[PDB]
């Protein structure tokens, strides 16, 4: 709790810093690697591929103006011709809207049967509550009540 309130004080103070600066002079404000580690969930890695491709990313700003003013185009050739994809299969798994994938992606992968990760994995019964037939919603609802 003292930490909770400590956060609001810092929040208002940064508001006074930014607001003040304009007088002295949004969501697009540049970010820090701890702030970067703050957003994304567990289990991901940061990559450099090169130092050189990274220098391309740094020149990219300057080259977003520069290389957009330069030669470029795309074309296709006529030639004869694998196609993987995932819905939510198991037995049934009522359908996923194209956005909801972000939430339910963990259910899509078929890796199965090896603790908590299996409780989150089995907790996708939510999906059965959200979308599905009314009976699936009923039975799912009870099953999650008793659990």
């Amino acid at each position: 709790a003292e930490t909770p309130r400590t956060d609001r004080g810092g929040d208002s103070i940064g508001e006074t810093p930014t607001p003040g600066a304009s007088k002295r002079k949004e969501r697009n404000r540049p970010l820090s690697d701890e702030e970067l580690d703050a957003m994304f969930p567990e289990g991901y890695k940061v990559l450099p591929p090169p130092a050189g491709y990274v220098p391309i990313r740094t020149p990219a700003r300057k080259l977003t103006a520069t290389p957009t003013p330069l030669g470029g185009m795309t074309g296709f050739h006529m030639q004869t011709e694998m196609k993987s994809v995932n819905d939510q299969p198991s037995g049934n798994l009522p359908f996923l809207k194209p956005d909801d994938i972000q939430y339910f992606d963990k259910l899509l992968v078929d890796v199965d049967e090896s603790e908590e990760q299996k409780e989150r994995k089995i907790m996708k019964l939510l999906l059965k509550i959200k979308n599905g037939t009314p009976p699936m919603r009923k039975a799912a609802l009870r099953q999650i009540t008793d659990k």
């Binding site: 006529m78 030639q79 004869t80």
Partner: protein
């Protein structure tokens, strides 16, 4: 099935041919244009 395999192969070969004949042309065009530009700058100097 044989006709399809050999046919696809042949058309592929013809494709790398057309591409190979294309790139030389592109570079010839860029060199030509660069020559025109250098001549233009020289005419700008004098």
């Amino acid at each position: 099935y044989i006709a399809d395999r050999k046919a696809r192969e042949a058309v592929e070969m013809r494709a790398q041919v057309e591409r190979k004949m294309a790139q030389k042309e592109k570079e010839k065009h860029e060199e030509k244009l660069r020559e025109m530009a250098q001549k233009a700058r020289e005419r700008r100097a004098g």
